[PDB]
Design a protein around this ligand. Structure first.
Ligand code: AP5
Length: 214
């Protein structure tokens, strides 16, 4: 099956992606992880994102579409995948449609703007796997360590307050309209749409999603 996760910065998409992946056995396609990885390794496809991400702005549709195409062509996506942080704009959604990439579920994670900044300062990550934690809301089993590899967790270069605020603006400008776009898609019978309350505890959000996805 094919799923799109939608919602504001910090809404909880990546956290639940992990559960959907390890549960329904489809790969997580995370544009944020992919772009960070490209920057880290200096890969020709995506190293360009470095400064853009630092400024809290969106990377060009052109760049991210290329990355997803390349990722989605891999054997492990043949029977479905989870798009997490993509599409991010209408043109990104349109490209998918032009390329014949329909999806079965669009899942919207609703969180009030006012919870976003506070929430994200607690965020810690394991960049090699893309796993994410929160020091209060979803701590690692061992303080400061990734559960799976025991490596020291880091803080994302773009998780600073000022940068989160810029991302939230860009989100409302460019990304928020995908709610209407995919709702219309659902009204046309092209996919299923569901909104979840992303203010509930992680386990409860996981439970709600299970109800939706079966
Ligand atoms: N398609 C695209 N086009 C153009 N540019 C692109 C692009 N994709 C990426 N980019 C670029 O990359 C930069 C960052 O993009 P990206 O990394 O994709 O997203 P973000 O806006 O930076 O923040 P997230 O979307 O990763 O948050 P989330 O909804 O996954 O929530 P999370 O599960 O982490 O949780 C947040 C925190 O809270 C915790 N938490 C999770 N759920 C809950 C809960 N229910 N209650 C309490 N805490 C919770 C977590 O543990 C964590 O600490 C962009 O600004 C841009 O430059």
């Amino acid at each position: 099956m094919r799923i799109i996760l939608l919602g504001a910065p910090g809404a909880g998409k990546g956290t639940q992606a992990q559960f959907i992946m390890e549960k329904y056995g489809i790969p997580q396609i995370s544009t944020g992880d992919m772009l960070r990885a490209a920057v880290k390794s200096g890969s020709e496809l995506g190293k360009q994102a470095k400064d853009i991400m630092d400024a809290g702005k969106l990377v060009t549709d052109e760049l991210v579409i290329a990355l997803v195409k390349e990722r989605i062509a891999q054997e492990d996506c043949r029977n479905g995948f989870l798009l997490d942080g993509f599409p991010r704009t209408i043109p990104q959604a349109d490209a998918m449609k032009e390329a014949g990439i329909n999806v079965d579920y669009v899942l919207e994670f609703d969180v009030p703007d006012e919870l976003i900044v506070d929430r994200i300062v607690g965020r810690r990550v394991h960049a090699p796997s893309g796993r994410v934690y929160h020091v209060k809301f979803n701590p690692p089993k061992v303080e400061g360590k990734d559960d799976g590899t025991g490596e020291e967790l880091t803080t994302r270069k773009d998780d600073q307050e000022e940068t989160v605020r810029k991302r939230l603006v860009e989100y409302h400008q460019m990304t928020a309209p995908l709610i209407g776009y995919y709702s219309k898609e659902a009204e046309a019978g092209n996919t299923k749409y569901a909104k979840v309350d992303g203010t509930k505890p992680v386990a409860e959000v996981r439970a709600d999603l299970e109800k939706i996805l079966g």
